[PDB]
Design a binder for this molecule. Structure first.
Ligand SMILES: CN1c2ncccc2C(=O)N[C@H]1c1ccc(Cl)cc1Cl
Ligand SMILES: [Zn+2]
Length: 208
């Protein structure tokens, strides 16, 4: 029951989502190995993901968390890149979409840096790159990211360089403690704590 609604580039909503995408690009410690080499994106399309049952599943869980955390859901808008994005927008997030080998355990990971999520579009470590050219830095092929509404509740803070949340917490926050320019990454352990709100289609752009 998912429908996708295209946003106009003239729409303030398109513009605010594009700005969050573009402004959160950073350099990565792999020199571009996983995600490719780029400083900005060519945004091709931004679509709103509308699914009433998935939305109600999200808001139900959001209310439970909020009531466990002094009426504070601690909701964020975060990026998610995955080879499962077409399944996620139709079926919702669930344990099949978790990263079993993640550093905070088997969970569903999200990023503040759009370029961090871009590293995972073609799989863990960028897999083998795009299916057409086998190129992790492909400038031709269209990529997709999700910009998701995420309930963190009481988040366990890890200072750093499906499983359960730590007891007494609803998520984990990975705070960068070496790279002064990296933004945070977050993990949830219940698929109901995220809603895939926007589907963003783009290309990475070759630096000039
Ligand atoms: C694991 N990965 C991430 N890790 C840190 C920050 C953000 C992300 C993200 O955007 N995607 C996840 C992810 C990628 C691929 C697969 Cl198969 C599962 C996940 Cl959870
Ligand atoms: Zn390609």
């Amino acid at each position: 029951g998912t429908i996708l609604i295209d946003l106009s580039p003239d729409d303030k909503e398109f513009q605010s989502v594009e700005e969050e995408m573009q402004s959160t690009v950073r350099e990565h410690r792999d020199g571009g190995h996983a995600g490719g080499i780029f400083n900005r994106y060519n945004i091709l399309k931004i679509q709103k993901v509308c699914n009433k049952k998935l939305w109600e599943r999200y808001t139900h869980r959001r209310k439970e968390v909020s009531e466990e955390n002094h009426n504070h859901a601690n909701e964020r808008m975060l990026f998610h890149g995955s080879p499962f994005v077409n399944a996620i927008i139709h079926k919702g997030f669930d344990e099949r979409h978790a990263y079993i080998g993640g550093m905070f355990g088997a969970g569903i990971y999200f990023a503040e840096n759009s370029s961090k999520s871009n590293q995972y579009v073609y799989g863990i470590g960028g897999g083998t790159g795009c299916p057409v050219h086998k190129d992790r830095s492909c400038y031709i092929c269209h990529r997709q990211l999700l910009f998701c509404r995420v309930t963190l509740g009481k988040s366990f803070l890890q200072f750093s360089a499906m499983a359960h949340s730590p007891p007494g917490h609803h998520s984990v926050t990975g705070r960068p403690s070496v790279n002064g320019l990296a933004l945070a990454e977050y993990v949830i352990y219940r698929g109901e704590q995220a809603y895939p709100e926007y589907l963003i289609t783009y290309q990475i752009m070759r630096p000039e």
